[PDB]
Amino acid sequence: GSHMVIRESVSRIYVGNLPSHVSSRDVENEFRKYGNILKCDVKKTVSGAAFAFIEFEDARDAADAIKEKDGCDFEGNKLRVEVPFNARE
RNA sequence: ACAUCA
Numbered sequence: 001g002s003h004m005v006i007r008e009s010v011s012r013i014y015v016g017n018l019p020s021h022v023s024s025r026d027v028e029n030e031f032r033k034y035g036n037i038l039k040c041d042v043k044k045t046v047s048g049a050a051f052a053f054i055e056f057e058d059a060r061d062a063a064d065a066i067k068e069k070d071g072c073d074f075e076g077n078k079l080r081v082e083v084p085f086n087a088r089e
Numbered sequence: 090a091c092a093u094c095a
Contacts, residue, residue: 014091041093053092072090082090 001085010038011059011087013066016051016080017073027052035061049078059087 001009013031024040031037031054038055045051056062063083072080 012092016091039093039095043092045091051091055093080090084091 004089005087007088009085009087011056011062012083012085013054013056013062013069014051014082014084015054015069016049016082017078018050018052019078021050022052024052024054027054031056031062031065034065 015027022042024042028037028040031040034056036057038057040052040054043051043053066081066083069081072082074080
């Protein structure tokens with residue numbers, strides 16, 4: 001998970017407070033340019049917000065997406081992007 | 090802040 005892992009594990013993206021509702025296949029069609037995706041899925045909370053999760057074959061190539069998609073927002077607009085599974089930092 | 094099950 002966190003800290004200097006030294007190879008192994010698999011990197012992912014998390015997006016939350018997402019616009020309307022995404023299909024996992026539609027966001028795969030965008031993320032695939034940063035590297036091959038192994039799995040993706042979508043979720044929701046009883047608070048009414050929605051989430052999506054997108055796996056990647058290498059962390060540092062996918063990080064160019066995570067850093068341009070950065071800056072979460074609230075209390076007037078819905079969008080959030082974060083990487084808890086920040087492998088090879 | 091939050092999931093993976095393929």
